[PDB]
Amino acid sequence: SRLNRESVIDAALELLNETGIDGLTTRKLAQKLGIEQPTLYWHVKNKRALLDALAVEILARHHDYSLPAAGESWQSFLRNNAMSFRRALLRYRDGAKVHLGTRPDEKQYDTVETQLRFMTENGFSLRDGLYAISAVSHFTLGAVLEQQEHTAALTDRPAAPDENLPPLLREALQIMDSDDGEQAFLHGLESLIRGFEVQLTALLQIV
């Protein structure tokens, strides 16, 4: 194969969907590309280096609501931004676990800076703006991880005997499974956003 950055990464992403993060090794990537290991080592030093790069690339390719639109309200930006972030994490098996074990890349700095400036120029102290942005991040991350890791454990685990399930719980699990968690996610998201709105509005009032 061709062995530039882009090709190595295209191959790595496909491999990730076949094996998931734990079955992703340098040996298997060498095979898939049709090359010996020392050849690969020249381009890719080890597993950590590869993951760091996949993290960055998943967002660069698929997280396209990174910045506010012109005139857009902070509420709406938080909404769209979070939607875009879940979509991207979901696009690859173990996407979220790949992201988690990484920190922001040079390329991502000034995208995040712009996000922080945008909140402050809308009335948030730098602190409160960061808290808001983190909260949305964490909530999203956790919601996707519980979806993805729950479906990764359906392999080695039994079913729950609906027999001894109590009634509310039984109805509750049927509801989680009716979709991917999108509804619970969007509903939760609105509650977060309004909660930040109440905090901002209050200023120095007791609220």
Ligand X SMILES: CN(C)[C@@H]1C(O)=C(C(N)=O)C(=O)[C@@]2(O)C(O)=C3C(=O)c4c(O)ccc(Cl)c4[C@@](C)(O)[C@H]3C[C@@H]12
Ligand Y SMILES: CN(C)[C@@H]1C(O)=C(C(N)=O)C(=O)[C@@]2(O)C(=O)C[C@@H]([C@]3(C)OC(=O)c4c(O)ccc(Cl)c43)C[C@@H]12
What type of residue is 189? L
Integer-rounded Cα radius of gyration of the chain = 21
* Residue 31 touches ligand Y, criterion: CB under 6 A: no
Q: Using the 8-state DSSP alphabet, how is residue 153 labeled?
A: S
- Residue where the block lists tokens 């390719």: 61
* Residue 167 touches a second copy, criterion: CB under 8 A: yes
Q: Using the 8-state DSSP alphabet, how is residue 68 labeled?
A: P
CA distance 130 to 171: 37
Longest dimension (CA), the chain: 67
CA distance 191 to 189: 5
- Integer angstrom CA distances of residue 72 from 75, 78, 198: 8, 10, 19
* Residue 48 touches a second copy, criterion: CB under 8 A: yes
* Residue 193 touches a second copy, criterion: CB under 8 A: yes
Q: Which residues in the 125-184 window bind ligand X by CB under 6 A?
A: 133, 136-137, 169, 172-173, 176
How would you classify residue 96: left for phi > 0, otherwise alpha for psi between -120 and 50, otherwise beta? alpha
**Sequence-separated (6 or more) residues with CB below 8 Å from residue 135:** 192, 196
Binding range to a second copy, per CB under 8 A, among 24-32, 63-71, 84-92, 133-141: 133-141
Tokens of residue 87, six digits = 């979509």
How near is the Cβ of 3 to a second copy at its closest, in Å?
Answer: 22
- Selected from 19, 31, 122, 199, the binder of a second copy by CB under 8 A is 199
* Contact pattern for a second copy over residues 173 through 192, marking x by CB under 8 A: x-xx------xx--xx-xxx
**Which residues in this chain contact ligand Y in the complex, by CB under 6 A?**
59, 63, 66, 81, 85, 103-104, 108, 111-112, 133-134, 136-137, 146, 173
**Which residues in this chain contact a second copy in the complex, by CB under 8 A?**
46, 48, 52, 100-104, 106, 109-110, 112-113, 116-117, 120, 126-128, 130-132, 134-135, 137-143, 145-146, 148-153, 156-157, 160, 164-169, 171-173, 175-176, 183-184, 187-188, 190-196, 198-199
**Which residues in this chain contact ligand X in the complex, by CB under 6 A?**
59, 63, 66, 81, 85, 103-104, 108, 111-112, 133, 136-137, 169, 172-173, 176
